[PDB]
Amino acid sequence: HMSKKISGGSVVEMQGDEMTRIIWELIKEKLIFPYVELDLHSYDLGIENRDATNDQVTKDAAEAIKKHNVGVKCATITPDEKRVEEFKLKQMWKSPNGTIRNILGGTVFREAIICKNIPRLVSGWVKPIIIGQHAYGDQYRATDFVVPGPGKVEITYTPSDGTQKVTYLVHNFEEGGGVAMGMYNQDKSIEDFAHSSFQMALSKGWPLYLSTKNTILKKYDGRFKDIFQEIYDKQYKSQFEAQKIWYEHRLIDDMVAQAMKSEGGFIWACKNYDGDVQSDSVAQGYGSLGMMTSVLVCPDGKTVEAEAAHGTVTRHYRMYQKGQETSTNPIASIFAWTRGLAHRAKLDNNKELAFFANALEEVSIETIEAGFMTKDLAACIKGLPNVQRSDYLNTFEFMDKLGENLKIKLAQAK
């Protein structure tokens, strides 16, 4: 007898670049499509198609996520001066992640996948650390310019209702020039950031910490601390205490030290810049960047976008281009699919898709914990200089082993 495939529903797919693009196709062909039939709204976010469409494909992909609520994104190249020369781009297009995050809005939650046999670089980290980055404002919408010489730099606020213009002196340059910057953030954006952070901490049963530098920026960072405390006392304190958890504000330099010596197991709300930086530090501390997942939680509580936290792994792609053997970890990209398929299952109440999404996550961890892993995870065990070829599998061997273990697990469940 033949087995019918799972009806998956509508998912927005965004193809990427370089080695993650190769991994992306292997995941679809071997892990998803044999078992799930999807109404796939696919958008080619490769660097060449973004140039051909003048980055309009990035625009349409973001709007498609709005309409279908679920999106899975492959890692894409952010153009710099080297990529403009390499691909002969018309202009230096903006980062597709920044464009997508601008249209959707929300908080980017990043979390490392943990395997019991993969040692971390930070010894005490047992439970995962979930960092929630406020995906709006601060340095990423700032106006910076070069000060060419001596002169007065001021920042002013002119109320829209007419009068009461206020001028703040930044610096009076007296010897030479330099640089100056102005940046901002919005009350409504910080409020949505707070709600998603308190909701995430409650759904996991973990305490929440928000990091600012309000000792120095008493008004700018004070607004973040004030809004978080206001919403916590009014709408979340009793729920936190009922779950034996808590929320506390922390100075950023105190937060990174507390996290370094902690055991993990907490939600770490971060401002835009801090979330970008500390997430890569935390990801590397757990072992490998190929194990860090990411999901954008939009303020509507209904739209999400999952993707791997790492990039396109250009160094491995070059090896792949010259025919050399590679060992690229696909776990983060796999969990981008499972997190998106799980959310699609939740919205549609698709028990079959929900069971499948979790089974693929279990197969991935069970395979590594059974001793079958890529070179990056073997280096966590033995140290890179001591890794033998027999200690790991290449990019295609690991995908094959995952595909076989997934076929076995889904057959047993039936």
Ligand X SMILES: NC(=O)c1ccc[n+]([C@@H]2O[C@H](COP(=O)([O-])OP(=O)(O)OC[C@H]3O[C@@H](n4cnc5c(N)ncnc54)[C@H](OP(=O)(O)O)[C@@H]3O)[C@@H](O)[C@H]2O)c1
- Interacting positions 123-152 with Ca ion (CB under 5 A): none
Sign of the alpha-carbon dihedral angle for 20, 21, 27, 32: positive
Joined together, the tokens standing for residue 342 give 């799980």
Could you tell me whether strands 36-44 and 6-15 are parallel, antiparallel, or unpaired per DSSP bridges? parallel
From Ca ion, a second copy, ligand X, none, interface partner of 139 (C-beta below 5 to 8 A by class) = a second copy
Asked if 197 and 271 touch (Cβ cutoff 8 Å), the reply is no
Minimum distance from residue 56 beta carbon to ligand X (Å): 18
Cα separation, 186 vs 137, whole angstroms: 8
164-223 residues in contact with a second copy (CB under 8 A) are 166, 168-171, 173-190, 213, 215-221, 223
Residue choice 134, 310, 339, 344 for contact with ligand X (CB under 6 A):
310
* Interaction mask 49-88, a second copy, x per CB under 8 A: -----------------------------x-x--------
Residues 6+ positions from 76 with CB-CB distance below 8 Å? 14, 16, 17, 45, 46, 47, 50, 96, 97, 312
Is residue 309 within the footprint of ligand X (CB under 6 A)? yes
Is 290 or 340 the residue whose CB approaches ligand X more closely? 290
Q: How far is the CB of 194 from a second copy (least distance, A)?
A: 14
Nearest to 290 by CA among 265, 313, 269: 313
Report the nearest approach of a second copy to the CB of residue 166 (Å). 7
- Distance CA(155)–CA(165), nearest Å, equals 11
139 binds a second copy (CB under 8 A): yes
Residue 409 contact, options Ca ion, a second copy, ligand X, none, Cβ 5-8 Å cut-off depending on partner type? none
Nearest to a second copy of 151, 371 (CB atom) = 151
Q: Are 289 and 120 in contact (CB under 8 A)?
A: no
Q: Rounded to the nearest whole angstrom, what is the least distance from the CB of residue 353 to ligand X in the complex?
A: 25
Per CB under 6 A, 108 contacts ligand X: no
Report the distance separating Cα 127 and Cα 125, nearest Å: 6
The residue range among 5-13, 107-115, 276-284, 376-384 that interacts with Ca ion, by the rule CB under 5 A, is 276-284
- Listed in order, strand segments (DSSP E) in 252-348 are 266-270, 292-297, 304-308
> Within a 10 A sphere around the Cβ of 347, how many other Cβ atoms?
16
Binding site for Ca ion (CB under 5 A): 253, 276, 280
Catalog residues that contact ligand X under the rule CB under 6 A: 75-78, 97, 254, 289-290, 307-315, 328-329, 332, 374, 376
